[PDB]
Write a protein that binds this ligand. Structure first.
Ligand SMILES: COC[C@H]1O[C@@H](O)[C@H](O)[C@@H](OC)[C@@H]1O
Ligand SMILES: COC[C@H]1O[C@@H](O)[C@H](O)[C@@H](OC)[C@@H]1O
Ligand SMILES: COC[C@H]1O[C@@H](O)[C@H](O)[C@@H](OC)[C@@H]1O
Ligand SMILES: COC[C@H]1O[C@@H](O)[C@H](O)[C@@H](OC)[C@@H]1O
Ligand code: NA
Ligand code: NA
Ligand code: NA
Ligand code: NA
Ligand code: NA
Lengths: 340, 339
């Protein structure tokens, strides 16, 4: 597995970006833009405490309250939630299980959060809120499979969750809800290829899933649904470069996908669709810096891409599609990824 | 009440704009882009049948199935829905009641559609799916009040629905859910002013409701939440101009609000925030054309505002933000607004 993300990032309900990372104390810390604009100053680092052995995953409930999921020191799944939107936080609470990956989080069409994780059998497990943005939580259930990467989850344009994972053959496998909100899932299906990173999945402007991954010659590769919310999938295509991290993918305000990755010089590179969505790809460009994690991208309230990465000082650095100069948000972050 | 929207518009689950309006036959017709791009070609008008006496209101379910709400000839609320995402249509079904307004439709945080309509007692009534994107429907419930306009509905940035309406005083009133997904509503509250259009409400890029209405001098006024998801509201402010339609508001790809309205010369006028979201407003500017309806606005998949309006030929016309040539989508539409 290629070097992974160190921070989770989300757009709050009031348009401020909020980053979550693991500290040197193995607590979860969070930083928040003071105002909803590109190159806004930040609140400074605030601790949620806890003791975590994975990447924390933040997700926004459908009522605007942030929720963070992480593997505890017992290797169970823990979580913690805002008690009101953008306000105070609950105590940490255990969802049990034993997980050997980073969680992957998405919300069902009925506002119920689903969490996915590799188990000790290397099978993919899930647990869900049994009501909209609310406990109590279901029991753990297995979707079987044998996965050698962290899972990645997105929703189909028809409301069916779809999970992607590397298998024991190192091809990309994937599995889908049979209906929206359903505990009934499809068989595992191979999309072939050779993947040397966690897959990252995004929905295109035209409702098609597109998956990106590092492949065998350290080039970036992608594969996409050829029609909305179904097969057949395209063949693998190459975007070249030589990368040394997982890719981070995001949509510009006009629908054009942009991909960010660490290069061989440990600088941040990017490549974007030109003209429009489902248009041709540019050549790679450098944004410089020196990074010790995969980048993480998100779109701010202004429609500008913002990218976050750990530096050599183990602080979090930001750059925005102004691109701007690199700036430090300070702090001291660790790579607690369950699968390295 | 200022001349209403003639079409309802949605960006479908595959980035294709789809238009719903009433034809000369009093059926609901729909037109859909063939490709998810600005100035794409259109499928041509397909009928969903029915006989309607309101503007039809379309909403995307959480699973991507369009659903359409319209007053029937019996003055009941009727609906028809896609059986699969961007695929075949059900038959019309009645949700009953007796309504004296255009419906207004939003989705709760649990994926249950809520529908709002004036009743025969001039009160605000509502009815809801009892599960995510599915029947059965709840029974009609009153939120009381006395309203002399079509309600407008939006969700707060904390998951609480909020409904806006002109009262008997011609002032902007509103009422809100107490908790996300709740049947327990606040009391009615007045934001004051004097308005001669239906109110139009949008969520800003920073989680604040802003409401737009035509004032008694036929100028454009707006008022806003001063903090995310609650009071106090600001004072009314004018953006001046003279408008002869309901204004339509939409958020640009970068969060800058933009308002569209018919002028006294029956042309399309627009005004926009400059620099950033919550920047200062531009000056009014024309896009020419001659329209016999209020304009409707929507962001397409390329991030460009598209505007729809009936012309003097009663065909639906489309202009988009490059701006483009006016383009006829053809057909023959009627202003069926219940008010
Ligand atoms: C996510 O934080 C969970 C941790 O909460 C801590 O407060 C507990 O001491 C510790 O158990 C010894 C858990 O792993
Ligand atoms: C010395 O750096 C080699 C880089 O060469 C660049 O031309 C590639 O695009 C880039 O891959 C994204 C490589 O890392
Ligand atoms: C949406 O169309 C509703 C109308 O459908 C018609 O087909 C019904 O016969 C008629 O019943 C009076 C309804 O008003
Ligand atoms: C939305 O109400 C705006 C009203 O604001 C008042 O301040 C104006 O005097 C009045 O114009 C005579 C407007 O209608
Ligand atoms: Na990162
Ligand atoms: Na939720
Ligand atoms: Na779902
Ligand atoms: Na990785
Ligand atoms: Na709600």
């Amino acid at each position: 597995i290629a070097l992974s993300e160190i921070v989770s990032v989300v757009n709050t309900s009031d348009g401020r970006i909020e980053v979550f990372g693991v500290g040197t104390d193995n607590a979860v810390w969070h930083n928040r833009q003071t105002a909803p604009h590109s190159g806004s100053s930040w609140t400074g680092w605030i601790s949620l405490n806890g003791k975590v052995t994975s990447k924390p995953v933040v997700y926004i409930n459908t009522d605007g309250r942030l929720e963070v999921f992480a593997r505890g020191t017992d290797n169970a799944l823990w979580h913690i939630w805002q008690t009101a939107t953008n306000a105070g936080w609950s105590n940490w609470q255990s969802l049990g299980g034993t997980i050997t990956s980073n969680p992957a989080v998405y919300v069902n069409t009925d506002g119920r959060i689903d969490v996915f994780a590799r188990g000790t059998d290397n099978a993919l497990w899930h647990i869900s809120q049994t009501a909209a943005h609310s406990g109590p939580w279901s029991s753990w259930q297995s979707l079987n499979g044998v996965i050698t990467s962290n899972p990645a989850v997105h929703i189909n344009s028809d409301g069916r969750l779809e999970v992607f994972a590397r298998g024991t053959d190192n091809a990309l496998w994937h599995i889908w809800q049979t209906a929206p909100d359903s505990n009934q899932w499809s068989g595992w299906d191979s999309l072939g290829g050779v993947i040397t990173s966690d897959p990252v999945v995004i929905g295109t402007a035209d409702g098609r899933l597109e998956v990106f991954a590092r492949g065998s010659n350290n080039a970036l590769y992608h594969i996409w649904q050829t029609v909305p919310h179904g097969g057949p999938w395209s063949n693998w295509a190459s975007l070249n470069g030589v990368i040394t991290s997982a890719p981070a993918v995001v949509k510009n305000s006009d629908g054009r996908l942009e991909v960010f990755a660490r290069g061989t010089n440990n600088a941040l590179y990017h490549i974007w669709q030109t003209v429009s969505h489902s248009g041709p790809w540019s050549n790679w460009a450098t944004l410089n810096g020196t990074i010790t994690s995969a980048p993480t991208a998100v779109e701010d309230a202004d429609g500008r891409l913002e990218v976050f990465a750990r530096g050599t000082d183990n602080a979090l650095w930001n750059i925005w599609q102004a691109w701007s100069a690199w700036v430090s948000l300070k702090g001291s972050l660790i790579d607690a990824s369950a699968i390295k």
